[PDB]
Swiss-Prot record:
InterPro entries xrefs: Ribosomal_uL6-like, Ribosomal_uL6-like_a/b-dom_sf, Ribosomal_uL6_a/b-dom, Ribosomal_uL6_CS2
This protein's name: Large ribosomal subunit protein uL6A
Source taxon at top rank: Eukaryota
Miscellaneous field: Present with 52400 molecules/cell in log phase SD medium. There are 2 genes for uL6 in yeast.
Family under the similarity heading: Belongs to the universal ribosomal protein uL6 family.
Complexes and interactors: Component of the large ribosomal subunit (LSU). Mature yeast ribosomes consist of a small (40S) and a large (60S) subunit. The 40S small subunit contains 1 molecule of ribosomal RNA (18S rRNA) and 33 different proteins (encoded by 57 genes). The large 60S subunit contains 3 rRNA molecules (25S, 5.8S and 5S rRNA) and 46 different proteins (encoded by 81 genes). uL6 lines the binding pocket for eukaryotic elongation factor 2 (eEF2).
RNA sequence: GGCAUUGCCGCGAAGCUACCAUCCGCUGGAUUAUGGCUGAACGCCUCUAAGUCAGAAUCCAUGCUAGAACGCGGUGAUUUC
């Protein structure tokens, strides 16, 4: 309907500095620095009061104003990643064969190694994206935690780990073995 | 020794040749379907709309064959009369 103006607000907490050149967004917080290239969306950023960034689409269509809120959510996720962090908890699920998950090194690349999935002899190797920390959770059986500033990076690593453990040539409603994302939250608690 | 239109028979080197013999037949990317991530649209949801991951005997490359006889480069020597 070609809305004249549509805008969204990006709240910036105190310990966060957001540098926005043309469409290269850099967010700096306690936990590190994130960078995103948004040159494919054609939006306009403006700083209001050093705690608020407005992002606007002028004379935008339906898809354009949808992508505006997408941009706002992406920048909010960058800020949340540099303030709270992002942690995805996955639980290994298996009926008979225990799934052995470990961190191995190959040329200093820190792969996640999956052995014995459904009794397989094949060894699954999922590379760990830079910035993603892998921890094996004590006091919870068969739980892997992936943490990082970039929600995209941690979620993609969890997705890769889940997808590498897909069951083939079997009724997946019966053979439920795999490594599934069980929780998606932040690193810092109750903030 | 000749002839029998290579007279016939056995063996027969060379050459040619047989899954009737032996050897050899490569690995990278991008993708389809599909399964996903982030994520609005549509306070939720959503693989999709922006962006994005993986992925087929597929495609393009690597590799192999020919080398444009009007595509090109480097290089040697260039007629004592
Ligand atoms: Mg069957
Ligand atoms: Mg005679
Ligand atoms: Mg004779
Ligand atoms: Mg999701
Ligand atoms: Mg798309
Ligand atoms: Mg020629």
């Amino acid at each position: 309907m070609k809305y004249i103006q549509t805008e969204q607000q990006i709240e910036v907490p105190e310990g966060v500095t957001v540098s926005i050149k043309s469409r290269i967004v850099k967010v700096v917080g306690p936990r590190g620095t994130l960078t995103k290239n948004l040159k494919h969306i054609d939006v306009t950023f403006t700083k209001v009061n050093n705690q608020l960034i407005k992002v606007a689409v002028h004379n935008g269509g339906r898809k354009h104003v949808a992508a505006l809120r997408t941009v706002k959510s992406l920048v909010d996720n960058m800020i949340t990643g540099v303030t709270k962090g992002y942690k995805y908890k996955m639980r290994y699920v298996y009926a008979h064969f225990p799934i052995n998950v470990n961190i191995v090194e190959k040329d200093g690349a820190k792969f996640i190694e999956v052995r014995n999935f459904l009794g397989d002899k094949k060894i699954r190797n999922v590379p760990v994206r830079d910035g993603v920390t892998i921890e094996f959770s004590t006091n919870v059986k068969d739980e892997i935690v992936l943490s990082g500033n970039s929600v995209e990076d941690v979620s993609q690593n969890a997705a890769d780990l889940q997808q590498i453990c897909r069951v083939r040539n079997k009724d997946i409603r019966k053979f439920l073995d795999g490594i599934y994302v069980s929780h998606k939250g932040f690193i810092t608690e109750d903030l």
